[PDB]
Amino acid sequence: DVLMTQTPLSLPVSLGDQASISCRSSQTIVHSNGDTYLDWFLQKPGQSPKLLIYKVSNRFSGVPDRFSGSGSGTDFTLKISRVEAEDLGVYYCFQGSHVPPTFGGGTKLEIKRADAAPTVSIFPPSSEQLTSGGASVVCFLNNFYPKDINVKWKIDGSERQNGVLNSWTDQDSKDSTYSMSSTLTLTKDEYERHNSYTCEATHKTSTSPIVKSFNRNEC
Amino acid sequence: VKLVESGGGLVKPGGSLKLSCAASGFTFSNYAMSWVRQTPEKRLEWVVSISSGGSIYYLDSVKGRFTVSRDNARNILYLQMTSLRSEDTAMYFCARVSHYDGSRDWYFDVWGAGTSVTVSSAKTTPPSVYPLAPGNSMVTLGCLVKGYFPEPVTVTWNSGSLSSGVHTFPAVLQSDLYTLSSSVTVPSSTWPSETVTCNVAHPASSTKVDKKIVPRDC
Ligand SMILES: CCNC(=O)N(CCCN(C)C)[P@](=O)(Cc1ccc(NC(=O)C(F)(F)F)cc1)O[C@H](c1ccc([N+](=O)[O-])cc1)[C@@H](CO)NC(=O)C(Cl)Cl
Secondary structure, three states: OOOEEEEOOEEEEOOOOOEEEEEEEOOOOEOOOOOEOEEEEEEOOOOOOEEEEEOOOEEOOOOOOOEEEEEEOOEEEEEEOOOOHHHOEEEEEEEOOOOOOEEOOOEEEEEOOOOEOOEEEEEOOOHHHHOOOEEEEEEEEEEEEOOOOEEEEEEOOEEEOOOEEEEEOOOOOOOOOEEEEEEEEEEHHHHOOOOEEEEEEEOOOOOOOEEEEEEOOOO | OEEEEEOOEEEOOOOOEEEEEEEEOOOHHHOEEEEEEEOOOOOEEEEEEEOOOOOEEEOHHHOOOOEEEEEOOOOEEEEEEOOOOHHHOEEEEEEEEOOOOOOOOOOEEEEOOOEEEEEOOOOOEOOEEEEEOOOOOEEEEEEEEEEEEOOOOEEEEOOOOEOOOEEEOOOEEEOOEEEEEEEEEEEOOOOOOOOOEEEEEEHHHOEEEEEEOOOOOO
């Protein structure tokens, strides 16, 4: 099959900026009839994809002047001269010259804002859950930017990956920040065998990793 | 011009399901049609194209399992799925290809709203709800919604009263079940003084759990 590669995965832009998205194919996308079937789509949340550009550079009807496509062979580019609010979403390139037709992984267009440090919170397991034999320790890291963040869980000083479940929200429409939830779930049994449960995050807004801890013997 | 797909739902691994795509506003028979799926991971994948003249092209991984067909007299496109497997889980879109046999042009110009297909061994299950209270200017509280099925669940704080400062995270699928959490931030001079409850509602089971968040020493 032909592998379509898009770069970047996420693109932070300010309203009014010029955006350019790259799409590379693993082999030539030129059809035997001389044409190149490289298309571009925009998908906004809760909606289905919408055709923007067909056959490398033709604008589909109703599509504003700001969008333009170019490229040839294996390298193609989509360009948005002026990024408006309605352009936020995920852009996909697609090759229809060869079977099977394939899509690129997508490039998310997000709003740039000032760097913001996360507000971290840690929660011990509730008595209700411990009564069931389970023990989840929850860590919320809210309203930070950029989205790049690294969270590690440490129990009595040792890193633990087993039983960790992370979920990230999309960009907040109000303040343009991101929030993340990280849950370390173990058993009541092992939970009572350890003392220090630490949620530590590394983010560019701080040199020292941001730590938040809960000690079962200080409750 | 409109494409409306139907037939989606929950199916057991190895089961069968038939999707329908009803077309309106255009000469159905003069166009090629296609089904495209979008996985939970949001990846887009072409499944099959059937040309106006009847030529059929399938993705290798569904060849022999999926059969596409069209009823030109009734403006309907079908997709008979069989021997379904977890990897088939996705949103299925019906799409028109601006192409008729022989034409030098082809692209997806019209899409349906999509119909959901979930391949899994699982029964409608209520979620366990746990209050998250801390062990400062403001205070952050939460609710953990664990082990439920199927999607979705609804989470509110004080019956919509609390709307701002809320963060509900997308459900993650683990061990065949979904887990979701939600946080709310309030002025330290609001709680414990005033009550704070997360209203969890699982439409599927008509479940409605109200979990009051009470201060507690760990
Ligand atoms: C074995 C017979 N040979 C061929 O089949 N082809 C020639 C291959 C030549 N190489 C091996 C060198 P091929 O290029 C294979 C192909 C099939 C589908 C798609 N895209 C999509 O399906 C979509 F998703 F991108 F739209 C792209 C290419 O067919 C083309 C085609 C385009 C669109 C549709 N459609 O939309 O249904 C059907 C068929 C075209 C010739 O060109 N045919 C026709 O118009 C016939 Cl007269 Cl029907």
